[PDB]
Symmetry: C3
Subunit: 90 residues, 3 copies
């Protein structure tokens, strides 16, 4: 057991986002070609996965953050992180 990370990237700069679960929280580090900085994403969790896709120039990110009990999807669509509709079962 260590930290656990997830990564996604887009474009040809590129932009990179690295999510790290450690000590009960998932945080986000960002690269847009100018140096690493801390992103806005911050949620509880012990495990994280991520995927992203471009629509034209606009990035859309989905982070699947899992605590001990619940996987919550968090959505970046250019204007803040929002709770997604994802559920693990119907």
């Amino acid at each position: 057991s260590s930290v656990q990370t997830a990564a996604t990237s887009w474009g040809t700069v590129p932009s990179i986002r690295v999510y790290t679960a450690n000590n009960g929280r998932i945080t986000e580090r960002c690269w847009d070609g100018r140096g690493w900085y801390t992103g806005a994403f911050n949620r509880p969790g012990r495990n994280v996965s991520v995927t992203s896709w471009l629509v034209g120039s606009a990035i859309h990110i989905r982070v699947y953050a899992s605590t001990g009990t619940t996987t919550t999807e968090w959505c970046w669509d250019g204007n803040g992180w929002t709770r997604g509709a994802y559920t693990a079962t119907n």
Copy 2:
């Protein structure tokens, strides 16, 4: 220790697949723009990773499912999950 997830996405709808290892099995939840539903993928495992790529409009998915002893590659190529040639060592 929690559930562990992996995610992939494709297209501009987009389609998303989220694989979750929990309680000894890896299951799959799917988004094609119309709501989340449970996919056909179901294999034993404690850890999962995934990658996918498009060939034209056709998606190809590779899921790396790891039990306590073995990582098995599972392949989606439009017509069922099949065992892949992946091995961890030669």
Copy 3:
């Protein structure tokens, strides 16, 4: 607890890289359409994530390798693995 893997792919062959953390080390298995073989990447770690992007025909890979204490970014840009600038905090 098992092995832990991460995967990335590119192109339409495709090429695939699967990173496996097991027994203290992260190793790499490669598919370029001709069979699986062992890649050059080998670093200590218990957890791994990966992302990659193409610039034209040239692949660029970023592997985030985490030991018990440190996440190190490793960079493939066509001519060897190099230590990346990534840090988890500023």
